[PDB]
Protein backbone atom coordinates (compact mmCIF):
# COMPACT_ATOMS: atom_id res chain seq x y z
CA UNK A 1 0.00 0.00 0.00
CA UNK A 2 3.06 2.18 0.37
CA UNK A 3 3.16 0.94 -3.26
CA UNK A 4 -0.17 2.66 -3.96
CA UNK A 5 1.58 5.67 -2.45
CA UNK A 6 4.73 5.82 -4.62
CA UNK A 7 2.70 5.26 -7.81
CA UNK A 8 0.35 8.11 -7.23
CA UNK A 9 3.45 10.20 -6.68
CA UNK A 10 5.29 9.47 -9.93
CA UNK A 11 2.05 10.15 -11.83
CA UNK A 12 2.11 13.72 -10.43
CA UNK A 13 5.75 14.12 -11.65
CA UNK A 14 4.70 12.79 -15.01
CA UNK A 15 2.06 15.48 -15.57
CA UNK A 16 4.54 18.01 -14.18
CA UNK A 17 7.68 17.51 -16.29
CA UNK A 18 5.55 18.39 -19.32
CA UNK A 19 5.07 21.89 -17.76
CA UNK A 20 8.60 21.86 -16.39
CA UNK A 21 10.08 21.78 -19.88
CA UNK A 22 7.88 24.62 -20.97
CA UNK A 23 9.75 26.44 -18.24
CA UNK A 24 13.38 25.62 -19.14
CA UNK A 25 12.41 26.60 -22.64
CA UNK A 26 10.77 29.90 -21.68
CA UNK A 27 13.98 30.73 -19.84
CA UNK A 28 16.24 30.40 -22.87
CA UNK A 29 13.70 32.29 -24.99
CA UNK A 30 13.99 35.14 -22.47
CA UNK A 31 17.74 35.04 -22.06
CA UNK A 32 18.11 35.20 -25.84
CA UNK A 33 15.65 38.01 -26.48
CA UNK A 34 17.88 40.95 -25.40
CA UNK A 35 21.07 39.36 -26.77
CA UNK A 36 19.64 39.24 -30.27
CA UNK A 37 18.51 42.76 -29.50
CA UNK A 38 22.13 44.00 -29.05
CA UNK A 39 23.55 42.08 -32.02
CA UNK A 40 20.73 43.06 -34.42
CA UNK A 41 21.58 46.64 -33.43
CA UNK A 42 25.15 46.19 -34.73
CA UNK A 43 24.07 44.24 -37.78
CA UNK A 44 21.74 47.15 -38.50
CA UNK A 45 24.75 49.37 -39.02
CA UNK A 46 26.38 46.92 -41.41
CA UNK A 47 25.70 47.34 -45.09
CA UNK A 48 24.71 44.30 -47.06
CA UNK A 49 25.04 42.19 -43.97
CA UNK A 50 21.90 40.23 -44.85
CA UNK A 51 22.48 40.34 -48.60
CA UNK A 52 25.80 38.67 -47.86
CA UNK A 53 24.58 36.09 -45.39
CA UNK A 54 21.78 34.74 -47.59
CA UNK A 55 24.03 34.32 -50.65
CA UNK A 56 26.72 32.57 -48.57
CA UNK A 57 24.45 30.17 -46.77
CA UNK A 58 24.76 27.19 -49.02
CA UNK A 59 21.65 25.19 -48.08
CA UNK A 60 19.35 28.20 -48.48
CA UNK A 61 19.57 28.48 -52.28
CA UNK A 62 18.15 25.01 -52.76
CA UNK A 63 14.64 26.06 -51.78
CA UNK A 64 14.12 28.98 -54.16
CA UNK A 65 14.36 29.98 -57.82
CA UNK A 66 17.70 31.41 -58.93
CA UNK A 67 15.95 34.59 -60.22
CA UNK A 68 14.80 35.33 -56.66
CA UNK A 69 18.28 36.51 -55.76
CA UNK A 70 17.95 39.84 -57.55
CA UNK A 71 15.21 40.57 -55.04
CA UNK A 72 16.76 38.61 -52.22
CA UNK A 73 19.79 40.93 -52.40
CA UNK A 74 17.53 43.77 -51.25
CA UNK A 75 17.05 42.36 -47.73
CA UNK A 76 17.89 45.10 -45.23
CA UNK A 77 16.66 43.27 -42.17
CA UNK A 78 15.46 39.96 -40.76
CA UNK A 79 14.07 39.66 -37.24
CA UNK A 80 12.92 36.49 -35.46
CA UNK A 81 10.41 36.76 -32.63
CA UNK A 82 9.31 33.87 -30.43
CA UNK A 83 5.60 34.11 -29.55
CA UNK A 84 5.78 32.14 -26.29
CA UNK A 85 6.96 35.37 -24.66
CA UNK A 86 3.78 37.32 -25.51
CA UNK A 87 1.20 34.99 -23.80
CA UNK A 88 1.26 31.41 -22.47
CA UNK A 89 -1.23 30.85 -25.33
CA UNK A 90 1.65 29.97 -27.64
CA UNK A 91 3.81 26.88 -28.37
CA UNK A 92 7.36 27.33 -27.11
CA UNK A 93 8.25 26.50 -30.75
CA UNK A 94 6.02 29.23 -32.23
CA UNK A 95 7.62 32.33 -33.71
CA UNK A 96 7.43 35.02 -36.38
CA UNK A 97 9.92 36.24 -38.98
CA UNK A 98 10.09 39.81 -40.15
CA UNK A 99 11.86 40.82 -43.36
CA UNK A 100 12.72 44.13 -44.87
CA UNK A 101 13.07 44.65 -48.60
CA UNK A 102 14.20 47.96 -49.94
CA UNK A 103 12.80 47.26 -53.43
CA UNK A 104 14.03 48.41 -56.83
CA UNK A 105 13.12 50.97 -59.50
CA UNK A 106 10.16 50.11 -61.71
CA UNK A 107 10.12 46.43 -60.70
CA UNK A 108 10.04 45.73 -56.93
CA UNK A 109 8.30 47.90 -54.30
CA UNK A 110 9.91 48.52 -50.92
CA UNK A 111 8.22 46.54 -48.15
CA UNK A 112 8.37 44.73 -44.83
CA UNK A 113 6.75 41.35 -44.26
CA UNK A 114 6.06 39.25 -41.14
CA UNK A 115 4.89 35.68 -41.67
CA UNK A 116 3.77 33.77 -38.56
CA UNK A 117 4.50 30.15 -37.75
CA UNK A 118 2.85 28.14 -35.04
CA UNK A 119 2.12 24.50 -34.45
CA UNK A 120 -1.26 22.77 -34.88
CA UNK A 121 -2.78 19.79 -33.00
CA UNK A 122 -3.38 16.19 -34.18
CA UNK A 123 2.67 15.34 -32.20
CA UNK A 124 1.70 18.64 -33.84
CA UNK A 125 2.76 19.98 -37.24
CA UNK A 126 4.10 23.51 -37.91
CA UNK A 127 1.78 25.73 -39.96
CA UNK A 128 1.30 29.20 -41.42
CA UNK A 129 -1.34 31.74 -42.40
CA UNK A 130 -0.98 33.65 -45.69
CA UNK A 131 0.34 37.16 -45.60
CA UNK A 132 0.42 39.87 -48.27
CA UNK A 133 3.46 40.99 -50.27
CA UNK A 134 4.13 42.86 -53.55
CA UNK A 135 5.63 40.37 -56.02
CA UNK A 136 8.11 41.96 -58.47
CA UNK A 137 6.67 43.26 -61.71
CA UNK A 138 8.74 40.69 -63.59
CA UNK A 139 6.91 37.87 -61.81
CA UNK A 140 3.80 39.10 -63.54
CA UNK A 141 3.74 35.95 -65.67
CA UNK A 142 3.88 33.68 -62.64
CA UNK A 143 1.82 35.77 -60.25
CA UNK A 144 -1.05 33.80 -58.63
CA UNK A 145 -3.18 36.96 -58.36
CA UNK A 146 -2.62 37.57 -62.05
CA UNK A 147 -3.76 34.14 -63.22
CA UNK A 148 -7.40 33.86 -64.30
CA UNK A 149 -7.63 30.09 -63.90
CA UNK A 150 -5.18 27.91 -61.91
CA UNK A 151 -7.07 24.76 -63.07
CA UNK A 152 -6.65 25.68 -66.74
CA UNK A 153 -3.83 23.77 -68.39
CA UNK A 154 -1.71 26.93 -68.93
CA UNK A 155 -2.85 28.27 -65.57
CA UNK A 156 -1.78 25.35 -63.40
CA UNK A 157 1.49 25.56 -65.38
CA UNK A 158 2.21 29.19 -64.49
CA UNK A 159 0.91 28.87 -60.93
CA UNK A 160 3.15 25.89 -60.16
CA UNK A 161 5.96 28.13 -61.41
CA UNK A 162 5.53 31.16 -59.13
CA UNK A 163 4.93 28.70 -56.28
CA UNK A 164 8.61 27.88 -56.52
CA UNK A 165 9.86 31.40 -55.85
CA UNK A 166 10.31 32.78 -52.34
CA UNK A 167 7.19 34.85 -52.71
CA UNK A 168 5.20 31.64 -53.17
CA UNK A 169 6.56 30.87 -49.75
CA UNK A 170 4.50 33.65 -48.12
CA UNK A 171 1.30 31.78 -49.05
CA UNK A 172 2.49 28.49 -47.66
CA UNK A 173 0.39 27.14 -44.77
CA UNK A 174 1.31 23.46 -44.49
CA UNK A 175 -2.26 22.31 -44.92
CA UNK A 176 -2.39 21.75 -48.64
CA UNK A 177 0.30 19.12 -48.98
CA UNK A 178 1.57 19.08 -52.56
CA UNK A 179 -0.47 22.16 -53.45
CA UNK A 180 1.65 25.00 -52.02
CA UNK A 181 5.29 25.98 -51.68
CA UNK A 182 7.64 23.00 -51.33
CA UNK A 183 9.08 22.42 -47.87
CA UNK A 184 7.91 25.80 -46.67
CA UNK A 185 8.00 24.57 -43.06
CA UNK A 186 11.60 23.43 -43.32
CA UNK A 187 12.60 26.77 -44.77
CA UNK A 188 10.84 28.65 -42.03
CA UNK A 189 12.64 26.36 -39.59
CA UNK A 190 15.89 27.07 -41.39
CA UNK A 191 15.51 30.74 -40.69
CA UNK A 192 14.37 30.27 -37.15
CA UNK A 193 17.03 27.79 -36.09
CA UNK A 194 20.08 28.38 -38.30
CA UNK A 195 20.06 31.42 -40.56
CA UNK A 196 18.94 33.96 -37.94
CA UNK A 197 20.69 32.36 -34.96
CA UNK A 198 24.06 32.22 -36.82
CA UNK A 199 23.73 34.94 -39.41
CA UNK A 200 27.03 36.21 -38.03
CA UNK A 201 29.05 33.03 -38.41
CA UNK A 202 28.17 33.17 -42.10
CA UNK A 203 29.00 36.76 -42.67
CA UNK A 204 32.45 36.06 -41.18
CA UNK A 205 33.04 33.18 -43.64
CA UNK A 206 31.94 35.14 -46.69
CA UNK A 207 34.65 37.57 -45.51
CA UNK A 208 37.47 35.17 -46.52
CA UNK A 209 40.60 36.68 -48.09
CA UNK A 210 41.21 34.99 -51.53
CA UNK A 211 38.33 34.23 -53.97
CA UNK A 212 38.36 30.58 -52.78
CA UNK A 213 36.65 30.10 -49.40
Amino acid sequence: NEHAKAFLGLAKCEEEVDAIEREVELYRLNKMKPVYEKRDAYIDEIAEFWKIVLSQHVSFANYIRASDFKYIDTIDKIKVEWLALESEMYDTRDFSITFHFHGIEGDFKEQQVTKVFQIKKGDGILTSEPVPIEWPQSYDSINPDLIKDKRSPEGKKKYRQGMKTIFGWFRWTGLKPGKEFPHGDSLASLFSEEIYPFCVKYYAEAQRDLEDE
Binding site: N1, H3, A4, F7, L8, L10, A11
Partner: protein, 394 residues
Amino acid sequence: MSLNDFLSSVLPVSEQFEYLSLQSIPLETHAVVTPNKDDKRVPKSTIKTQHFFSLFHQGKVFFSLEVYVYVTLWDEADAERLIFVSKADTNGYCNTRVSVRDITKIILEFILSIDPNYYLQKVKPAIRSSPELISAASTPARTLRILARRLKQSGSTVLKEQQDLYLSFTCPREILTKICLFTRPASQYLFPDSSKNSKKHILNGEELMKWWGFILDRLLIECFQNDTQAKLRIPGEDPARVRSYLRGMKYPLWQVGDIFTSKENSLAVYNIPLFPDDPKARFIHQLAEEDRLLKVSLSSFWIELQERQEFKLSVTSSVMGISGYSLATPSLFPSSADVIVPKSRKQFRAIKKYITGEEYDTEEGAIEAFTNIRDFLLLRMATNLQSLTGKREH
Protein backbone atom coordinates in the same frame (compact mmCIF):
# COMPACT_ATOMS: atom_id res chain seq x y z
CA MET B 1 8.83 -37.91 -37.87
CA SER B 2 10.23 -35.01 -35.84
CA LEU B 3 12.17 -32.05 -37.24
CA ASN B 4 15.02 -33.50 -35.16
CA ASP B 5 14.82 -36.75 -37.18
CA PHE B 6 14.86 -34.77 -40.39
CA LEU B 7 17.91 -32.61 -39.86
CA SER B 8 19.87 -35.51 -38.43
CA SER B 9 19.05 -37.39 -41.63
CA VAL B 10 20.90 -34.81 -43.72
CA LEU B 11 23.95 -33.96 -41.62
CA PRO B 12 27.22 -35.92 -41.79
CA VAL B 13 27.20 -38.90 -39.32
CA SER B 14 28.87 -38.83 -35.88
CA GLU B 15 28.77 -35.04 -36.23
CA GLN B 16 26.98 -32.92 -33.63
CA PHE B 17 24.97 -29.78 -34.33
CA GLU B 18 22.49 -27.55 -32.61
CA TYR B 19 19.50 -25.73 -33.97
CA LEU B 20 16.75 -23.21 -33.16
CA SER B 21 13.12 -23.46 -34.25
CA LEU B 22 11.34 -20.26 -33.30
CA GLN B 23 7.73 -19.89 -34.29
CA SER B 24 5.56 -16.84 -33.89
CA ILE B 25 2.07 -16.95 -32.36
CA PRO B 26 -0.56 -17.55 -35.09
CA LEU B 27 -2.17 -14.19 -35.67
CA GLU B 28 -5.46 -13.55 -37.48
CA THR B 29 -4.59 -11.14 -40.25
CA HIS B 30 -5.83 -9.69 -43.52
CA ALA B 31 -6.22 -11.57 -46.79
CA VAL B 32 -3.07 -12.86 -48.45
CA VAL B 33 -4.50 -11.84 -51.83
CA THR B 34 -6.27 -8.43 -51.97
CA PRO B 35 -10.02 -9.21 -52.15
CA ASN B 36 -12.40 -7.39 -54.49
CA LYS B 37 -15.58 -5.95 -52.93
CA ASP B 38 -18.33 -7.32 -55.17
CA ASP B 39 -17.00 -10.92 -55.08
CA LYS B 40 -18.82 -14.20 -54.28
CA ARG B 41 -16.13 -15.90 -52.19
CA VAL B 42 -13.91 -13.65 -50.16
CA PRO B 43 -11.84 -15.31 -47.36
CA LYS B 44 -13.40 -15.84 -43.93
CA SER B 45 -10.03 -15.51 -42.13
CA THR B 46 -6.25 -15.56 -42.77
CA ILE B 47 -3.91 -17.14 -40.20
CA LYS B 48 -0.28 -16.03 -40.39
CA THR B 49 2.65 -17.66 -38.67
CA GLN B 50 6.38 -17.35 -38.83
CA HIS B 51 8.85 -20.16 -38.67
CA PHE B 52 12.46 -19.20 -38.10
CA PHE B 53 15.38 -21.62 -37.95
CA SER B 54 19.07 -21.46 -37.14
CA LEU B 55 21.73 -24.15 -37.11
CA PHE B 56 24.75 -24.25 -34.87
CA HIS B 57 28.00 -26.07 -35.17
CA GLN B 58 30.60 -25.99 -32.40
CA GLY B 59 28.97 -23.05 -30.68
CA LYS B 60 28.78 -20.95 -33.84
CA VAL B 61 25.66 -20.10 -35.86
CA PHE B 62 26.05 -20.54 -39.61
CA PHE B 63 22.63 -20.74 -41.22
CA SER B 64 19.11 -19.44 -40.73
CA LEU B 65 15.83 -19.59 -42.63
CA GLU B 66 12.69 -17.46 -42.56
CA VAL B 67 9.46 -18.90 -43.87
CA TYR B 68 5.86 -17.74 -43.39
CA VAL B 69 2.90 -20.09 -43.35
CA TYR B 70 -0.55 -18.70 -44.22
CA VAL B 71 -3.74 -20.76 -43.74
CA THR B 72 -6.89 -19.37 -45.45
CA LEU B 73 -10.52 -20.21 -44.53
CA TRP B 74 -13.31 -19.54 -47.07
CA ASP B 75 -15.92 -21.40 -45.01
CA GLU B 76 -16.71 -24.55 -43.00
CA ALA B 77 -14.31 -26.90 -44.84
CA ASP B 78 -13.10 -24.86 -47.81
CA ALA B 79 -9.51 -24.21 -46.73
CA GLU B 80 -6.12 -23.66 -48.27
CA ARG B 81 -2.53 -23.35 -47.08
CA LEU B 82 0.43 -21.40 -48.45
CA ILE B 83 4.09 -21.74 -47.65
CA PHE B 84 6.11 -18.67 -48.45
CA VAL B 85 9.89 -18.66 -48.30
CA SER B 86 11.36 -15.32 -47.43
CA LYS B 87 15.02 -15.60 -46.54
CA ALA B 88 17.74 -18.14 -46.16
CA ASP B 89 21.29 -17.11 -45.35
CA THR B 90 24.71 -18.45 -44.35
CA ASN B 91 27.80 -16.81 -42.87
CA GLY B 92 30.53 -19.28 -43.90
CA TYR B 93 31.61 -19.73 -40.28
CA CYS B 94 30.87 -23.40 -40.29
CA ASN B 95 34.04 -25.36 -39.54
CA THR B 96 32.75 -28.58 -41.14
CA ARG B 97 31.03 -28.82 -44.55
CA VAL B 98 27.32 -29.56 -45.13
CA SER B 99 24.67 -29.48 -47.87
CA VAL B 100 22.82 -26.24 -47.09
CA ARG B 101 20.54 -27.34 -49.95
CA ASP B 102 19.27 -30.48 -48.25
CA ILE B 103 19.04 -28.78 -44.94
CA THR B 104 16.68 -26.22 -46.43
CA LYS B 105 14.67 -28.77 -48.44
CA ILE B 106 14.24 -30.95 -45.37
CA ILE B 107 13.19 -28.11 -43.11
CA LEU B 108 10.47 -27.43 -45.68
CA GLU B 109 9.37 -31.05 -45.88
CA PHE B 110 8.88 -30.83 -42.19
CA ILE B 111 6.78 -27.67 -42.40
CA LEU B 112 4.88 -29.51 -45.10
CA SER B 113 3.97 -32.43 -42.87
CA ILE B 114 2.49 -30.06 -40.32
CA ASP B 115 -1.27 -30.53 -39.89
CA PRO B 116 -2.86 -27.18 -40.81
CA ASN B 117 -5.04 -27.57 -37.71
CA TYR B 118 -1.96 -26.80 -35.61
CA TYR B 119 -2.27 -23.23 -36.74
CA LEU B 120 -5.97 -23.30 -35.88
CA GLN B 121 -6.06 -23.86 -32.10
CA LYS B 122 -5.49 -20.35 -30.61
CA VAL B 123 -5.29 -17.33 -32.89
CA LYS B 124 -4.46 -13.88 -31.63
CA PRO B 125 -7.23 -11.78 -33.22
CA ALA B 126 -6.60 -8.60 -35.20
CA ILE B 127 -8.60 -6.45 -32.79
CA ARG B 128 -10.01 -7.58 -29.40
CA SER B 129 -12.86 -6.67 -27.06
CA SER B 130 -15.98 -3.78 -17.63
CA PRO B 131 -13.03 -1.34 -18.13
CA GLU B 132 -9.95 -0.51 -16.07
CA LEU B 133 -7.53 -1.79 -18.73
CA ILE B 134 -3.99 -0.63 -19.17
CA SER B 135 -3.07 -0.56 -22.88
CA ALA B 136 -1.14 1.19 -25.63
CA ALA B 137 -3.71 3.91 -25.00
CA SER B 138 -2.61 4.76 -21.44
CA THR B 139 -0.21 7.56 -20.55
CA PRO B 140 2.33 6.60 -17.86
CA ALA B 141 0.43 8.88 -15.50
CA ARG B 142 -2.87 7.12 -16.19
CA THR B 143 -1.42 3.63 -15.89
CA LEU B 144 0.10 4.55 -12.53
CA ARG B 145 -3.17 6.01 -11.30
CA ILE B 146 -4.78 2.76 -12.35
CA LEU B 147 -2.23 0.55 -10.57
CA ALA B 148 -2.96 2.73 -7.54
CA ARG B 149 -6.76 2.37 -7.39
CA ARG B 150 -6.35 -1.33 -8.15
CA LEU B 151 -4.07 -1.71 -5.12
CA LYS B 152 -5.99 0.48 -2.64
CA GLN B 153 -8.98 -1.69 -3.67
CA SER B 154 -7.56 -5.19 -4.15
CA GLY B 155 -4.60 -6.69 -2.24
CA SER B 156 -2.63 -6.86 -5.51
CA THR B 157 -2.13 -5.17 -8.88
CA VAL B 158 -3.27 -7.95 -11.28
CA LEU B 159 -6.77 -9.04 -12.49
CA LYS B 160 -9.10 -11.95 -13.49
CA GLU B 161 -8.63 -14.38 -16.39
CA GLN B 162 -12.52 -17.70 -17.77
CA GLN B 163 -10.32 -15.66 -20.16
CA ASP B 164 -10.90 -17.11 -23.63
CA LEU B 165 -10.62 -14.13 -26.02
CA TYR B 166 -8.23 -15.94 -28.43
CA LEU B 167 -9.87 -17.28 -31.64
CA SER B 168 -10.24 -20.92 -32.61
CA PHE B 169 -10.84 -22.71 -35.96
CA THR B 170 -10.78 -26.04 -37.84
CA CYS B 171 -10.34 -27.42 -41.39
CA PRO B 172 -9.71 -30.76 -43.24
CA ARG B 173 -6.29 -32.31 -42.48
CA GLU B 174 -5.69 -32.47 -46.27
CA ILE B 175 -5.86 -29.18 -48.11
CA LEU B 176 -4.48 -27.28 -51.03
CA THR B 177 -0.80 -26.78 -50.30
CA LYS B 178 0.90 -23.93 -52.09
CA ILE B 179 4.49 -22.76 -52.04
CA CYS B 180 5.74 -19.44 -53.26
CA LEU B 181 9.12 -17.87 -53.36
CA PHE B 182 11.13 -15.22 -55.10
CA THR B 183 14.76 -15.96 -55.70
CA ARG B 184 17.02 -12.96 -55.41
CA PRO B 185 20.64 -13.26 -54.36
CA ALA B 186 22.13 -10.70 -52.00
CA SER B 187 25.29 -10.43 -49.91
CA GLN B 188 23.39 -11.41 -46.78
CA TYR B 189 19.79 -11.75 -45.59
CA LEU B 190 19.97 -12.63 -41.90
CA PHE B 191 23.67 -12.30 -41.00
CA PRO B 192 24.79 -8.69 -41.28
CA ASP B 193 28.29 -8.01 -42.73
CA SER B 194 28.95 -11.76 -43.15
CA SER B 195 29.74 -10.89 -46.76
CA LYS B 196 32.97 -9.48 -45.31
CA ASN B 197 33.71 -13.12 -44.57
CA SER B 198 35.89 -14.68 -47.25
CA LYS B 199 34.90 -18.31 -46.60
CA LYS B 200 31.25 -17.31 -47.27
CA HIS B 201 29.93 -18.72 -50.56
CA ILE B 202 27.45 -16.53 -52.50
CA LEU B 203 25.36 -17.89 -55.39
CA ASN B 204 24.75 -15.43 -58.25
CA GLY B 205 21.44 -14.96 -60.05
CA GLU B 206 21.47 -18.02 -62.30
CA GLU B 207 23.15 -19.97 -59.51
CA LEU B 208 20.50 -19.37 -56.92
CA MET B 209 17.72 -20.14 -59.37
CA LYS B 210 18.89 -23.70 -60.11
CA TRP B 211 19.63 -24.25 -56.45
CA TRP B 212 16.11 -23.36 -55.42
CA GLY B 213 14.54 -25.15 -58.35
CA PHE B 214 16.27 -28.35 -57.32
CA ILE B 215 14.84 -28.04 -53.84
CA LEU B 216 11.33 -27.68 -55.23
CA ASP B 217 11.89 -30.38 -57.78
CA ARG B 218 12.89 -32.76 -55.02
CA LEU B 219 9.78 -31.77 -53.11
CA LEU B 220 7.31 -32.05 -55.93
CA ILE B 221 8.46 -35.61 -56.33
CA GLU B 222 8.81 -36.84 -52.76
CA CYS B 223 6.00 -34.88 -51.14
CA PHE B 224 3.47 -33.71 -53.69
CA GLN B 225 1.14 -35.53 -56.08
CA ASN B 226 1.68 -36.32 -59.74
CA ASP B 227 -0.74 -33.71 -61.04
CA THR B 228 0.54 -30.97 -58.77
CA GLN B 229 0.85 -27.75 -60.73
CA ALA B 230 4.36 -26.21 -60.77
CA LYS B 231 5.33 -23.00 -62.43
CA LEU B 232 8.48 -20.99 -63.00
CA ARG B 233 8.90 -17.42 -64.08
CA ILE B 234 12.09 -15.52 -64.92
CA PRO B 235 11.54 -11.78 -65.33
CA GLY B 236 13.15 -10.38 -68.48
CA GLU B 237 13.46 -13.83 -70.05
CA ASP B 238 11.91 -15.81 -72.91
CA PRO B 239 9.22 -18.52 -72.56
CA ALA B 240 11.55 -20.60 -74.74
CA ARG B 241 14.40 -19.73 -72.38
CA VAL B 242 12.62 -20.94 -69.28
CA ARG B 243 11.43 -24.19 -70.88
CA SER B 244 15.09 -24.95 -71.37
CA TYR B 245 15.85 -24.71 -67.64
CA LEU B 246 12.70 -26.68 -67.01
CA ARG B 247 13.88 -29.47 -69.25
CA GLY B 248 16.50 -29.92 -66.57
CA MET B 249 13.82 -30.65 -63.99
CA LYS B 250 13.13 -34.28 -63.16
CA TYR B 251 9.48 -33.33 -62.44
CA PRO B 252 7.30 -33.72 -65.58
CA LEU B 253 4.74 -30.93 -65.17
CA TRP B 254 6.90 -27.84 -64.61
CA GLN B 255 5.50 -25.10 -66.78
CA VAL B 256 6.15 -21.50 -67.55
CA GLY B 257 3.91 -19.11 -65.65
CA ASP B 258 2.74 -18.73 -62.10
CA ILE B 259 0.04 -20.14 -59.87
CA PHE B 260 -2.01 -16.93 -59.74
CA THR B 261 -3.21 -17.30 -63.30
CA SER B 262 -6.98 -17.56 -62.65
CA LYS B 263 -9.10 -16.35 -65.59
CA GLU B 264 -11.61 -15.17 -62.91
CA ASN B 265 -10.77 -11.45 -62.18
CA SER B 266 -8.16 -10.62 -64.85
CA LEU B 267 -6.66 -7.75 -62.85
CA ALA B 268 -3.31 -7.71 -61.05
CA VAL B 269 -4.27 -6.31 -57.66
CA TYR B 270 -6.85 -9.04 -57.04
CA ASN B 271 -4.47 -11.87 -57.92
CA ILE B 272 -0.98 -11.06 -56.67
CA PRO B 273 -0.37 -12.28 -53.14
CA LEU B 274 1.24 -9.82 -50.71
CA PHE B 275 4.23 -11.01 -48.63
CA PRO B 276 6.91 -9.57 -46.34
CA ASP B 277 9.66 -7.76 -48.11
CA ASP B 278 8.55 -9.19 -51.44
CA PRO B 279 9.01 -7.45 -54.79
CA LYS B 280 5.45 -8.54 -55.65
CA ALA B 281 4.22 -6.66 -52.63
CA ARG B 282 6.69 -3.88 -53.64
CA PHE B 283 5.60 -3.20 -57.23
CA ILE B 284 1.98 -3.53 -56.02
CA HIS B 285 2.18 -0.82 -53.40
CA GLN B 286 4.21 1.24 -55.90
CA LEU B 287 1.05 1.19 -58.07
CA ALA B 288 -1.13 2.05 -55.06
CA GLU B 289 0.72 5.37 -54.93
CA GLU B 290 1.01 6.28 -58.63
CA ASP B 291 -2.61 4.98 -58.73
CA ARG B 292 -2.63 2.22 -61.35
CA LEU B 293 -3.96 -0.64 -59.25
CA LEU B 294 -7.26 -0.84 -61.16
CA LYS B 295 -5.47 -0.51 -64.51
CA VAL B 296 -2.75 -3.24 -64.77
CA SER B 297 -3.75 -6.73 -65.83
CA LEU B 298 -2.00 -9.57 -64.11
CA SER B 299 -0.78 -10.06 -67.68
CA SER B 300 0.60 -6.52 -67.75
CA PHE B 301 1.84 -6.62 -64.18
CA TRP B 302 4.47 -9.19 -65.12
CA ILE B 303 5.55 -7.27 -68.17
CA GLU B 304 5.92 -4.00 -66.35
CA LEU B 305 7.65 -5.53 -63.35
CA GLN B 306 10.58 -6.58 -65.51
CA GLU B 307 11.38 -3.01 -66.46
CA ARG B 308 11.47 -0.24 -63.89
CA GLN B 309 15.09 -1.07 -62.98
CA GLU B 310 15.35 -3.39 -59.94
CA PHE B 311 15.15 -6.35 -62.27
CA LYS B 312 16.41 -4.22 -65.14
CA LEU B 313 19.64 -3.63 -63.28
CA SER B 314 19.93 -6.81 -61.19
CA VAL B 315 21.03 -10.40 -61.86
CA THR B 316 18.65 -13.28 -62.58
CA SER B 317 15.67 -13.58 -60.23
CA SER B 318 12.79 -16.04 -60.65
CA VAL B 319 9.32 -16.57 -59.23
CA MET B 320 8.39 -20.15 -58.49
CA GLY B 321 4.92 -21.29 -57.64
CA ILE B 322 3.36 -24.52 -56.47
CA SER B 323 -0.26 -25.68 -56.10
CA GLY B 324 -1.24 -29.28 -55.49
CA TYR B 325 -2.06 -31.85 -52.83
CA SER B 326 0.46 -33.58 -50.55
CA LEU B 327 1.19 -37.32 -50.98
CA ALA B 328 0.79 -38.15 -47.31
CA THR B 329 -1.84 -36.31 -45.29
CA PRO B 330 -0.20 -33.49 -43.30
CA SER B 331 -0.77 -34.30 -39.63
CA LEU B 332 1.91 -33.18 -37.21
CA PHE B 333 1.42 -30.98 -34.16
CA PRO B 334 5.12 -30.37 -33.35
CA SER B 335 6.69 -31.07 -29.96
CA SER B 336 8.25 -28.51 -27.65
CA ALA B 337 11.43 -29.93 -29.11
CA ASP B 338 10.05 -29.25 -32.59
CA VAL B 339 9.21 -25.57 -31.98
CA ILE B 340 9.71 -22.81 -29.39
CA VAL B 341 6.84 -20.36 -29.13
CA PRO B 342 7.73 -17.06 -27.44
CA LYS B 343 5.14 -15.54 -25.07
CA SER B 344 4.86 -12.44 -27.22
CA ARG B 345 5.90 -10.45 -30.23
CA LYS B 346 8.28 -8.79 -27.81
CA GLN B 347 10.11 -11.95 -26.74
CA PHE B 348 9.99 -13.49 -30.23
CA ARG B 349 11.67 -10.46 -31.76
CA ALA B 350 14.08 -10.44 -28.87
CA ILE B 351 15.57 -13.84 -29.62
CA LYS B 352 15.66 -13.35 -33.35
CA LYS B 353 17.69 -10.15 -32.99
CA TYR B 354 20.31 -12.09 -31.03
CA ILE B 355 21.16 -13.52 -34.42
CA THR B 356 19.88 -11.28 -37.20
CA GLY B 357 21.11 -8.24 -35.29
CA GLU B 358 24.68 -9.34 -34.67
CA GLU B 359 27.63 -8.25 -36.85
CA TYR B 360 29.33 -11.11 -38.73
CA ASP B 361 32.46 -9.66 -40.36
CA THR B 362 34.27 -11.76 -37.73
CA GLU B 363 33.71 -15.27 -36.35
CA GLU B 364 33.29 -13.22 -33.16
CA GLY B 365 29.66 -12.39 -33.91
CA ALA B 366 28.70 -15.95 -34.86
CA ILE B 367 30.15 -17.20 -31.61
CA GLU B 368 28.45 -14.36 -29.81
CA ALA B 369 25.09 -15.04 -31.45
CA PHE B 370 25.10 -18.65 -30.26
CA THR B 371 25.98 -18.17 -26.63
CA ASN B 372 23.55 -15.24 -26.31
CA ILE B 373 20.81 -17.51 -27.53
CA ARG B 374 21.44 -20.47 -25.26
CA ASP B 375 22.17 -18.22 -22.27
CA PHE B 376 18.84 -16.53 -23.01
CA LEU B 377 16.58 -19.51 -23.61
CA LEU B 378 17.87 -21.03 -20.41
CA LEU B 379 17.54 -17.83 -18.43
CA ARG B 380 14.25 -16.34 -19.51
CA MET B 381 12.51 -19.36 -20.92
CA ALA B 382 13.86 -22.41 -19.14
CA THR B 383 14.86 -24.04 -22.41
CA ASN B 384 17.77 -24.80 -24.70
CA LEU B 385 18.58 -25.76 -28.26
CA GLN B 386 18.28 -29.19 -29.75
CA SER B 387 21.38 -31.28 -30.03
CA LEU B 388 21.96 -33.24 -33.19
CA THR B 389 23.89 -36.38 -33.90
CA GLY B 390 24.46 -36.16 -37.64
CA LYS B 391 23.69 -39.44 -39.36
CA ARG B 392 24.33 -39.22 -43.09
CA GLU B 393 26.96 -41.45 -44.74
CA HIS B 394 29.62 -39.54 -46.76
